[PDB]
C-alpha cells in the first residue's frame, strides 16, 4: 500500500519490501540543532512510521547558524517545540511528536535511537540499555570542521543486501563435466569468488535447474566454475544463470567496549593517522565540557587549548593508546569546538539518515563502527583568524564566525553566485547559502534558473516544495522559501524560468557573466553540464559540479588557470541496442520494452502528426514525396487515418485494437517463421535459433487471458483519445464486441515500373481536399510516464509482455516497465544532502582564493557500502607555443575584428605559424585547401562579415565576442596546437 506516486524514485533505490518494513519502524532523535534537524528531515522524507523529538534546551541566537527551522522570533523557546510544527509538514504519512521527558524504559518503543549534542556519560547510559534490548543506536557529532559518527545495531544484525546491486544474470554457452561454465561470445559474468548462482533452461544437465545455489570460482572474465557435476550429466548446452545473494550476520560492540578498541572507517586514505587522533580529541572535548559546566573551549583561546591538550594526554594515557599526539591538529580541534557549519551538518545528517534507514530496513552494509571526518583544508589563510576576530558578535552567524572570523564573513556576504538548476541539489544548495549568509551584503546577489515545474514525485526529495505548490515554477518557489529561511535575502535573489543553453545567450550574456563570482551546476544531464562548463571556461569563472545516482555521488571543482575543466574527461555513454536485435530477435525484457515504445510512438504519434501536417500545409504532398524516405507509407497513413479506418464509435476502436493485435502478435511472427523456419540452419550448419535468438510462436487471441484483454483495452482507449471519443471500461462491452469477430484469412507470402506511381496518384486523389476539412484535427499522444490514467505505461507493459510471450521471455510488471521505458534516474535525499555538504565545503575554499591545487578536493562516495574518497584536481596541461608557456585550457588570443587576411598575416608574423583551418561554431570559415577563387572572395572580408555570410544569418545585437577555433602548422610543417581566438566585435 505504498503511495508510488510519491515514493517513485525512492522505491527504485530501496524496493517495495524495504519500504514496507520501514513504514513500521519508530525513530527517536535526541537533539534538535542543525545536525539533528537535518537527520530528522531526511528521515521524515524517507517515510519511516513516525519520528519523536527530544530537546528541552531553549533556543539561542547562535543556534540559527545551521538550524533552518528556527527564526529570531523563537529565541527562548525549546528547540523541539518550535521544530516539530515545521517538520510535520514535510511528509503527511509521517507523524512527528515531542517528548518532554526521557526515561530508559521509554526507549523500548523505538526501532532506532539517534543521539546528538549529548555528553559521553549520557551516551554510555543510553547505549548500555539499547545494546542489550536489540535497539539500533547511532551517535553523531559535529565540531567546527570535524565530524564523527558511531553506529551500533546489536550483536546479531542480519543484512539481507550488502552492496545494493542488482543480482547478476547471464547466458551460458557450455558447461563442461567439471563445472567450467563459459559465457557467450564476448560476454563477462562479472562475478567474484564465493558468490552463489542458480541455473535454468540448461539442456543436458537437468540437475542444475533445480534452483540450489552453488559456489563460484572465477577463473577469468568469461569463465567460472561451480564444482563437480559428474553425476548430473556429461555436458550442458545453453541456458541462463542468476546470482543468489545470501544474508550476512554482522556483530557490533557496545560504546563502552568500543571506546577501548575502536574499529575505524577511513573516509580519506591520504590521512590514515588522524582518526586515532580524533578519537582522543572528542573524548577530551567531552571531559572538558564535563569539567566546565558543559561549556566547550572558547574560540581560538590559548588557555583553553592548553587545558584541552592536558585532557587529551590524560585520556591517551588512561586508554593505553600507543599514539603520538599531534599538538597542532588537537589544538585545532580545540579552537573550532564551538563551530557550527551548515555544510558539515548536511554532510553528517545525510550519512546518519542513511544509517537510520539501514537500521530500519536491514539493507546495505552499515558503518562499523567509528567514522571520523575532517575538512580542515577549508580553513581560510588569506584573513586573520585569531581570538579577536573569532569572538561572537551576538548574531545568527556566530557558529560560523567561530571558525572563519568576521573578515571572512564579510567576504562571504559579498558573493555574486549563479546556480543552474533548482532540483534536489539546487534546493539543498540554496538552503546552505541562506544559512551561511551568502550574498546578504550590499554587493551580494544570487541568481537561480530552472524551466521545470513542481510535480508530486519531486516532493519526496526536494524539501523546499509542498503539495500546495505542485504545478508552480521551481525557481520562484525555492527563492521564496529561502527568503523565508533567511530574511536578509529579501530582494537579493533573482529567479529565471530560462533553460541554460545556446538559445538563452541573450539573457546570460557577457554583462551577466562578468559580474559573477562562481557558478554552481545542479543539473541532471550532460549536455547542460558541458555547455555551462564551456561558458565558465570562456569567462574564467570557478565552477562547482555535483551529481548523484541512487546512493552514489560525486563533486568536482573547476578553478581558472589552475585545474582542468569538466569537459576534459570522459564518462561511459548510455547503452543502446542494435536495430536487428530489437526488430526481430529479442532476448531480454529491455528489448521488448524498447520495441513497445517504438510501437506506441508509431501507432499513436507519427500518423497523427502526418495527418495534421497534411491538413495544415497547403502543399504537403510534394514535400512528402520528394523528402520522405518512404512517401508511400505516409500516404497510406493519411488515407487510413482520414477516410478508411476512421472510427465512428468505440466498437470500431475495439475492432481496430483486435486487428492490431493480430497484426503485431500473430501475423508478423508467422511471416518470420516462414522466412526462418524453426528447423533452419545457418550457412555453417549450426541451427539458426540457437544462442541469443529465441524461436517465436504466434499468439492466438483468448479473451480470458489477462494480457490480451489489457492490450485490447489500452489500444482501444488510446485510439479513442486520438480521435477524441468516449472510451468504455466495463469488460461486458469488450466481450460482446470481440465475440462477433471474424478474422480475415492470412497466408505468409513468398515474395516474387509505373504501377507504383499509379498507386501513389490513386491514393492521392482518394484523399479528401483540405478545404473540405477545416477545423478538424487529431490529437497526437505525447508520452507521459508519471500519469497513470492515460494508458501509456499500461499499453507499453501489455505490448512488451505479449512480445515476451511470443519469444518465451519472463514478463516484467508495470513498475519495472515504467523504470525502463521512462528512463527514470533513481534518486535519494541523503545523497543530495551529502553532495550539497561537500560542494559547500569546497565553496569556502573558492571564496578564500587558494592558489595551490593540493588544497582542493574532488569527492566520490557510495552510501550503500559506506565508501568515501577524495582526490586532488588534475592540473591543466601546459604546452609550448613560439617558445612561450601556454595553458592548454585557460589561454586564448584576443584580437580585434580585423580582416581574414590581416588575421593570417598576424599569425604568420607574430607566432610564426601558418594558418590552415579557421572555424566558428559549426561552420568552416577558412581552409587551406579551398579553391583560390573562393579564398580570394572570402579573404578581404572581416571576421564578423565572413561569419554572417557563411552561416547565412546576421549576428545578434547582443553578440560582443566571437570564439574561433584555429588549426595551424609551424614553419617545418608540423601541426602545433594553439588556444582559441576571442574576436572582439
Amino acid at each position: 500500500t505504498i503511495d508510488e506516486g510519491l515514493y517513485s524514485r525512492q522505491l527504485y533505490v530501496l524496493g517495495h519490501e524495504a519500504m514496507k518494513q520501514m513504514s513500521q519502524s519508530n525513530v527517536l532523535i535526541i537533539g534538535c540543532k542543525g545536525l539533528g534537524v537535518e537527520i530528522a528531515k531526511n528521515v521524515c522524507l524517507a517515510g519511516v512510521k513516525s519520528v519523536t523529538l527530544y530537546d528541552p534546551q531553549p533556543t539561542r541566537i547562535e543556534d540559527l547558524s545551521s538550524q533552518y527551522f528556527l527564526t529570531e522570533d523563537d529565541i527562548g523557546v525549546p528547540r523541539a517545540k518550535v521544530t516539530v510544527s515545521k517538520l510535520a509538514e514535510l511528509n503527511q504519512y509521517v507523524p512527528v511528536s515531542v517528548v518532554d521527558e526521557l526515561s530508559t524504559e521509554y526507549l523500548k518503543n523505538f526501532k532506532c535511537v539517534v543521539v546528538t549534542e549529548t555528553s559521553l556519560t549520557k551516551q554510555l547510559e543510553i547505549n548500555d540499555f539499547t545494546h542489550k534490548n536489540h535497539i539500533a543506536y547511532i551517535a553523531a557529532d559535529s565540531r567546527g570542521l570535524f565530524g564523527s559518527i558511531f553506529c551500533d545495531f546489536g550483536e546479531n544484525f542480519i543484512c539481507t543486501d550488502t552492496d545494493g546491486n542488482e543480482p547478476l544474470t547471464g547466458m551460458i554457452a557450455s558447461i563442461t563435466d567439471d563445472g567450467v561454465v563459459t559465457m557467450l561470445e564476448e560476454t563477462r559474468h562479472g562475478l567474484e569468488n564465493g558468490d552463489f548462482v542458480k541455473f535454468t533452461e540448461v539442456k543436458g544437465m537437468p540437475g542444475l535447474n533445480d534452483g540450489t545455489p552453488r559456489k563460484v570460482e572465477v577463473k577469468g572474465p568469461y569463465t567460472f566454475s561451480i564444482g563437480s557435476v559428474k553425476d548430473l550429466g556429461s555436458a550442458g548446452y545453453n541456458g541462463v544463470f542468476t546470482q543468489v545473494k545470501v544474508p550476512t550476520k554482522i556483530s557490533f560492540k557496545s560504546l563502552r567496549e568500543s571506546l577501548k578498541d575502536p574499529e575505524y572507517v577511513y573516509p580519506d586514505f591520504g590521512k590514515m593517522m588522524r582518526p586515532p587522533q580524533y578519537h582522543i580529541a572528542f573524548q577530551a572535548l567531552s571531559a572538558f565540557a564535563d569539567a566546565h559546566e558543559g561549556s566547550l573551549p572558547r574560540p581560538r583561546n590559548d588557555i583553553d587549548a592548553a587545558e584541552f591538550f592536558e585532557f587529551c594526554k590524560k585520556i591517551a594515557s588512561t586508554l593505553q593508546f600507543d599514539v603520538e599526539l599531534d599538538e597542532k591538529l588537537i589544538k585545532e580541534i580545540s579552537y573550532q569546538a564551538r563551530g557550527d557549519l551548515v555544510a558539515m551538518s548536511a554532510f553528517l545528517g545525510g550519512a546518519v539518515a542513511q544509517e537510520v534507514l539501514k537500521a530500519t530496513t536491514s539493507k546495505f552494509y552499515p558503518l562499523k563502527q567509528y567514522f571520523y571526518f575532517d575538512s580542515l583544508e577549508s580553513l581560510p589563510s588569506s584573513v586573520t583568524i585569531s581570538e579577536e576576530t573569532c569572538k561572537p558578535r551576538g548574531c545568527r552567524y556566530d557558529g560560523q564566525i567561530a571558525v572563519f572570523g568576521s573578515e571572512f564573513q564579510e567576504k562571504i556576504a559579498s558573493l555574486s553566485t549563479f546556480l543552474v538548476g533548482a532540483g534536489a541539489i539546487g534546493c539543498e544548495m540554496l538552503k546552505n547559502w541562506a544559512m551561511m549568509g551568502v550574498a546578504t551584503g550590499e554587493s551580494g546577489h544570487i541568481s537561480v534558473t530552472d524551466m521545470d515545474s513542481i510535480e508530486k514525485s519531486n516532493l519526496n526529495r526536494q524539501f523546499l516544495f509542498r503539495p500546495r505548490d505542485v504545478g508552480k515554477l521551481k525557481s520562484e518557489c525555492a527563492s521564496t522559501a529561502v527568503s523565508i529561511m533567511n530574511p536578509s535575502l529579501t530582494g537579493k535573489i533573482t529567479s529565471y524560468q530560462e533553460r541554460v543553453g545556446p538559445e538563452s545567450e541573450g539573457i546570460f550574456g557577457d554583462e551577466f557573466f562578468e559580474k559573477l563570482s562562481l557558478v554552481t551546476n545542479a543539473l541532471d544531464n550532460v549536455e547542460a553540464r558541458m555547455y555551462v562548463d564551456r561558458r565558465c571556461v570562456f569567462f574564467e569563472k570557478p565552477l562547482l559540479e555535483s551529481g548523484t545516482l541512487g546512493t552514489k555521488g560525486n563533486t568536482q571543482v573547476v578553478v581558472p588557470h589552475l585545474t582542468e575543466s569538466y569537459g576534459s574527461s570522459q564518462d561511459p555513454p548510455e547503452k543502446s541496442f542494435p536495430i536487428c536485435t530489437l526488430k526481430n530477435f529479442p532476448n531480454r525484457i529491455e528489448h521488448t520494452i524498447a520495441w513497445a515504445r517504438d510501437l506506441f510512438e508509431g501507432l499513436f504519434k507519427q500518423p497523427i502528426d502526418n495527418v495534421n501536417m497534411y491538413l495544415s500545409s497547403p502543399n504537403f504532398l510534394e514535400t512528402s514525396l520528394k523528402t520522405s524516405s518512404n512517401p508511400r507509407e505516409v500516404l497510406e497513413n493519411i488515407r487510413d487515418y482520414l477516410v478508411t479506418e476512421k472510427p465512428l464509435s468505440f466498437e470500431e476502436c475495439i475492432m481496430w485494437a483486435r486487428l492490431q493485435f493480430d497484426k503485431f502478435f500473430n501475423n508478423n511472427i508467422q511471416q518470420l517463421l516462414f522466412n526462418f523456419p524453426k528447423d533452419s540452419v545457418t550457412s555453417t550448419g549450426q541451427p539458426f535459433w540457437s544462442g541469443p535468438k529465441r524461436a517465436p510462436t504466434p499468439l492466438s487471441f483468448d479473451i480470458h487471458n489477462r494480457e490480451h484483454f489489457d492490450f485490447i483495452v489500452a489500444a482501444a482507449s488510446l485510439y479513442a483519445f486520438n480521435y477524441g471519443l468516449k472510451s468504455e471500461t466495463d469488460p461486458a462491452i469488450y466481450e460482446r464486441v470481440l465475440a462477433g469477430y471474424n478474422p480475415p484469412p492470412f497466408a505468409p507470402k513468398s515474395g516474387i515500373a509505373n504501377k507504383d506511381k499509379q498507386e501513389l496518384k490513386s491514393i492521392a486523389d482518394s484523399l479528401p481536399p483540405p478545404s473540405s476539412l477545416v477545423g478538424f484535427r487529431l490529437t497526437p499522444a505525447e508520452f507521459e510516464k508519471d500519469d497513470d490514467s492515460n494508458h501509456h505505461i499500461d499499453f507499453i507493459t501489455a505490448a512488451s509482455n505479449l512480445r515476451a510471450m511470443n519469444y518465451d521471455i519472463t514478463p516484467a510488471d508495470r513498475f519495472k516497465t515504467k523504470f525502463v521505458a521512462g528512463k527514470i534516474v533513481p534518486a535519494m535525499c541523503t545523497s543530495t544532502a551529502v553532495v550539497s555538504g561537500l560542494v559547500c565545503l569546497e565553496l569556502v575554499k573558492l571564496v578564500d582564493g587558494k592558489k595551490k591545487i593540493e588544497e582542493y578536493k574532488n569527492g566520490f562516495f557510495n552510501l550503500a557500502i559506506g565508501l568515501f574518497t577524495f582526490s586532488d584536481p588534475i592540473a591543466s596541461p601546459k604546452m609550448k607555443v613560439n617558445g612561450k608557456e601556454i595553458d592548454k585550457i585557460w589561454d586564448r588570443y584576443n584580437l580585434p575584428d580585423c580582416t581574414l587576411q590581416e588575421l593570417i598575416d598576424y599569425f604568420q608574423k607574430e607566432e610564426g605559424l601558418e594558418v590552415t583551418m579557421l572555424s566558428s561554431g559549426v561552420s568552416l570559415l577558412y581552409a587551406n585547401f579551398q579553391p583560390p577563387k573562393k579564398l580570394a572572395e572570402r579573404l578581404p572580408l572581416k571576421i564578423s562579415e565572413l561569419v554572417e555570410q557563411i552561416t547565412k544569418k546576421k549576428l545578434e545585437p547582443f553578440r560582443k565576442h566571437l570564439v574561433l577555433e584555429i588549426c595551424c602548422d609551424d614553419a617545418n610543417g608540423e601541426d602545433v596546437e594553439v588556444p582559441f581566438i576571442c574576436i572582439k566585435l
Partner: protein
Amino acid sequence: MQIFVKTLTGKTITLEVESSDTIDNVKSKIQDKEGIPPDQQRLIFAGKQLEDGRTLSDYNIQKESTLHLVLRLRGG
C-alpha cells in the same frame, strides 16, 4: 607486486604488477579485467588521482596498495 582496486560499486579486483609499470599498463590491465576503456578510468591512491605517463614508483605505490576506481554521475 600485487595491488587491489576497489570500485565505487563495491567490487574488488586483484592486479599483478611491478613497481616500474606505468599507469597506462595498469589501465590496460583494468580494461582487460573489466572492459572499461582506459580513457574512462579514474584511479585514486592516497588522495592523488593517477595520471597517464607516470610510473607507480612516482606515486609511492607499494605491494598490497589499495586504489579506488571511481566515476562521475549524471543525476542530481
